[PDB]
Nucleic acid binder design. Structure first.
Ligand SMILES: [Zn+2]
Lengths: 122, 134, 105, 50, 59, 52, 86, 19
RNA sequence: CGCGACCUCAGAUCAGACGUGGCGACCCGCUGAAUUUAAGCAUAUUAGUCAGCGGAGGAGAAGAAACUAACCAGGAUUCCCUCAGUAACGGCGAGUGAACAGGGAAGAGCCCAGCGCCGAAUCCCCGCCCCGCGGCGGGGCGCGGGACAUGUGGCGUACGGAA
RNA sequence: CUAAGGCUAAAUACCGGCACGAGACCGAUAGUCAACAAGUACCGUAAGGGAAAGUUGAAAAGAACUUUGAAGAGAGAGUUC
RNA sequence: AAGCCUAGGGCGCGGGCCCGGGUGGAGCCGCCGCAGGUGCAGAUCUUGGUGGUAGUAGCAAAUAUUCAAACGAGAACUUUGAAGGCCGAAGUGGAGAAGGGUUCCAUGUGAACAGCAGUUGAACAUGGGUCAGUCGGUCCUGAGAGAUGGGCGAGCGCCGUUC
RNA sequence: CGACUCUUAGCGGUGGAUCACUCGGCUCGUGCGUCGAUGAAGAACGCAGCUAGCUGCGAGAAUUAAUGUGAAUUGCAGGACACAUUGAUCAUCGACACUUCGAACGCACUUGCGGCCCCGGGUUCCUCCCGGGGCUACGCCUGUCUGAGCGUCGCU
């Protein structure tokens, strides 16, 4: 009676939607059974069905997401949802290269006059 | 005493960690020593209590030589239940009076494939200290 | 209200000094923090001296002292030109170089 | 006042559901110390200044 | 029915059409003094209310 | 002891002419701690004498 | 007649529920708050009321976003990686 | 809950004489 | 009577980015009192302190002398001790009150404009190819655009430098 | 010495926050206002003010059942050292 | 064990202390030194509790209740029937606005409130109840408030509504 | 002997002092030292089978996914799981999601009115109407486009 997640990975979007909307049917029916009394077995099935909606809705929201960024992989201008979100400040930091550039004068100093490894008392 | 400066060693902090421990830590604290005969067969000093083990009672009012199966483990109140350890209520109903796992010796474990992998790894670590400490 | 031969004392406690009391309970922890960073500094430069570059022979101004010899800021360029070491090579080899130091004597 | 706004009626709806006695099965919990609700607002002494 | 608070008379009329394929003469809504919205959906005279109510589960 | 202990309240004493005896008391409110007494070592709550 | 008889003509109100601080302090006539200052861009706070600063501070509410930042801070700010599957 | 304070409220003032 | 450059100034739901607000123990820039003392009180003191305003950072600020010294001279800045309750200020009353040097912790120096010399030798953006792309970068190809002579880049900054 | 241009870590501070460690400290009128559903209940239109309230028992084993009373309440009986 | 009580035995001038009995169930005491948030009869002291007053003052503003029956264990106060009254259409009536926010309705209870009682209630526990193209809001503008431009302001921002 | 009143003792009442406990505060010390237009802090409203408050969560609402661990949660029912299966519960959490107000961002806060595109019912665009989605705030930088000038000029 369990709805897993591994078996839902290798299905189609429309079949999982068919797997989604049919589960909505008893979810509406279980809320009908709650106000009519019914039985304790159908009352505990509300939580099982509700968590199965989230499992199916996760996979739809999962598998749609890496199809967008795979299509957008390599594109310079990606949407803001796909962009890295570290902080407000870490997005405002350097470009991982721009602190590594030295001037023509700064590069001239280090190769001509490098920091020499040395020792004393001899 | 303790020499790692990150160890609690505090009256308030150790009791706070013990009483407010989550469920998977509560499995480890509720560990019971094995019987004498299993100790030379598994080389394991203690093992957490399980659902379908059977238990010899060590101390308490129910102390004796009876061997009874665990009914169910009640990890909120840090205690387990035994089939033949109970107490009749006023109205004739029977209530399982619990025994703490520290006063519990296990005669035989309820083995599964996730349990055999724990017997050997505790025994493997037992043999490291014997060889290194020789 | 002075009474029977005390000194005329002038304590500087008329400000709200209690908000700005600097306690020194950090002293043993600061000594470990400085020392553990000093050993870590010496381990990054494995053959180099832990104290750093060489300091020059420097006499005191202010004729009160007038005779003691200190460890200076750095060797002047007039001292380096005699020894034959260029001023941009002495920094890399472990010689303290400053351009401000004059040489009158 | 029979001329309430949408936020005011939505505010009074939540305060109405908070005025309800505690269920009986709370008292049989292990780590429980709640005896009564101790927050039962009534319309006579508590007047809900809005 | 009990209807979600952010609904609309156009959507409620279309919703009961989508679920239980019954046409609607008019839809009538109110907001109860408990937080939610109640709807009095009026059927066309060509369908029977208690016939379809047994399909819902309520009687 | 924290210097804010016994000073987070905002109390000043009622003036002369009432049956109370010149203690800094809590200002108003339908509360148990209302016109009780604070800012003294003799009162319940409040500051300790010569705080460490 | 300034006492009990003057309390009877208290019908209309001056403050309502603010939509930024939530307290009943939004003045109707001035069209402004003043527990927090709603029409002002900056939240109204003052250092002469230390108790009022801690009534609504950073540590008071839900941390529906900031507690993730604290939780992500000790973990290394990694993104796009997953734990190694079985 | 316990009420707000309202004691005996400042008894009747007298006339103030000269010299 | 218009077209075509240039300068100034607009409109954009133009293409791509940026700032707002909060916390605020520590810091920076302002503004800024009265309680209190002087047995009163007005200068003084409280005190550039409380309050108010703006701004960030994990540290900030400061920082490599238009310096200290008068010595047989020291040599960026920051912190501790000491100078020192001293020089000095003060109805010279209450009181306020540094700095040099020395011993330490740490210790790292540099870059421009100008002067000049190199064919703008420089930089930004759009399209194509290869690499890696979850802190959008490297190389190549484009009479593909723009900025720039109202000055970009290289050598080069007081310790001299350039040819 | 070279102002009216600029950059620069380290020794420095940290009653906010995260995770900790420790105490010749207080032990429920004390210690933070708050050891507990505490900036909660409550008060004032508002700025703001702001509490009281720890402990059954090893284990609920929380007194089955008889009798008076409508019941609250009792007498018995029973559990626990 | 601590703590508490004591018509018991006592010691020391005294601060106080040692035993006996009872309750209690888990830590505590002497000596040598050390340290303090260290000894209460008052402060119209703070908190909390309890007395005399005292079963006392009091439950007296607006003409008035009586008889029989029903429910119940219980009736001066509930309900029904009858009688006698009052509010007398500027009402003790029938409806609204502001305000109150489930107080509106049914069932059940009578533990706590309704300063007596209550089989009753606006008390409590269960549920239920407010349906709009035409009724209002929504639209318009008045007194006024308030952005942009503009000006001022160290500054949050301020002035002003056609300049 | 009475009744009433005072003291002491026992027992029983009001009261919660003392004592022993303590998942709590205070102080000091160490490491790190991280908010936000990719929507911060805060606030409102909802979410459990029975759920009032606290806490947690956001229409996927007492948590979804993955990793680790490995037989429970539990107050009462219930039912998944076979723990010979990514598998109950917990922690980690790196994937997804995150209602409304709020710097709050179409115009103002009454939750009312707008416009520009795309899609599905209306329709087979032919305009109404309905539903869903993406946009529409200010300040400012580079570049692009369209412009203005009895500004400086040339061509005419
Ligand atoms: Zn507000």
């Amino acid at each position: 009676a369990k709805i897993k997640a591994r078996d839902l990975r290798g299905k189609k979007k429309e079949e999982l939607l068919k797997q989604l909307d049919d589960l909505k049917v008893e979810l509406s029916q279980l809320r009908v059974a709650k106000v009519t009394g019914g039985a304790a077995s159908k009352l505990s099935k509300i939580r099982v069905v509700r968590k199965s909606i989230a499992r199916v809705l996760t996979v739809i929201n999962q598998t749609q997401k890496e199809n967008l960024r795979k299509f957008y992989k390599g594109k310079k201008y990606k949407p803001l949802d796909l962009r890295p979100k570290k902080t407000r400040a870490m997005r405002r930091r350097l470009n991982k290269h721009e602190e590594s550039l030295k001037t023509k004068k700064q590069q001239r100093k280090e190769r001509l006059y490098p920091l020499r490894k040395y020792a004393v008392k001899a | 005493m303790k020499f790692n400066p990150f160890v609690t060693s505090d009256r308030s902090k150790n009791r706070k960690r013990h009483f407010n421990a989550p469920s998977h830590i509560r499995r480890k604290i509720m560990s019971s020593p094995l019987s004498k005969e299993l100790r030379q067969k598994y080389n394991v000093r203690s093992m957490p209590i399980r659902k379908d083990d059977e238990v010899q009672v060590v101390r308490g009012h129910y102390k004796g030589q009876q061997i009874g199966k665990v009914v169910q483990v009640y990890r909120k109140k840090y205690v387990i239940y035994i089939e033949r350890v109970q107490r009749e209520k006023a109205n004739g109903t029977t209530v399982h009076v619990g025994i703490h796992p520290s006063k519990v010796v296990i005669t035989r474990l309820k083995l599964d494939k996730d349990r055999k992998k724990i017997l050997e790894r505790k025994a493997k670590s037992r043999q490291v200290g014997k060889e290194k400490g020789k | 209200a002075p009474s029977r031969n005390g000194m005329i004392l002038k304590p500087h406690f008329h400000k709200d000094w209690q908000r700005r009391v600097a306690t020194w309970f950090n002293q043993p922890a600061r000594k470990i923090r400085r020392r553990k960073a000093r050993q870590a500094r010496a381990r990054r430069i494995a053959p180099r001296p832990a104290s750093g570059p060489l300091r020059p022979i420097v006499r005191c101004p202010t004729v009160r002292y007038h005779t003691k010899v200190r460890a200076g800021r750095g060797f002047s360029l007039e001292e380096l030109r005699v020894a034959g070491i260029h001023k941009k090579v002495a920094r890399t080899i472990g010689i303290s170089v400053d351009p401000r130091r004059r040489n009158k004597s | 006042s029979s001329h309430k706004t949408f936020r005011i009626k939505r505010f009074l709806a939540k305060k109405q559901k908070q005025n309800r006695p505690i269920p009986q099965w709370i008292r049989m919990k292990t780590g429980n110390k709640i005896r009564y609700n101790s927050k039962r607002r009534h319309w006579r002494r508590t007047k809900l200044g809005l | 029915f009990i209807v979600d608070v952010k609904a609309n008379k156009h959507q409620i009329k279309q919703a009961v059409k989508k679920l239980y394929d019954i046409d609607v003469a008019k839809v009538n809504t109110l907001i109860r003094p408990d937080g939610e919205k109640k709807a009095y959906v009026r059927l066309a005279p060509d369908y029977d209310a208690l016939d379809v109510a047994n399909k819902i589960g309520i009687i | 002891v924290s210097e804010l202990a016994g000073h987070q309240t905002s109390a000043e004493s009622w003036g002369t002419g009432r049956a109370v005896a010149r203690i800094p008391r809590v200002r108003g409110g339908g509360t148990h701690r209302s016109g009780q007494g604070a800012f003294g070592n003799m009162c319940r709550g409040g500051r300790m004498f010569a705080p460490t | 007649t300034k006492g009990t008889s003057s309390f009877g003509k208290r019908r209309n109100k001056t403050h309502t529920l603010c939509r930024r601080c939530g307290s009943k302090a939004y003045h109707l006539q001035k069209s402004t708050c003043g527990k927090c200052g709603y029409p002002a861009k900056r939240k109204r706070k003052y250092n002469w009321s230390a108790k009022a600063k801690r009534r609504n501070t950073t540590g008071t509410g839900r941390m529906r976003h900031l507690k993730i930042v604290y939780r992500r801070f000790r973990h290394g700010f990694r993104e796009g990686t997953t734990p190694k599957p079985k | 809950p316990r009420p707000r304070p309202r004691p005996r409220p400042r008894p009747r003032p007298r006339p103030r004489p000269r010299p």
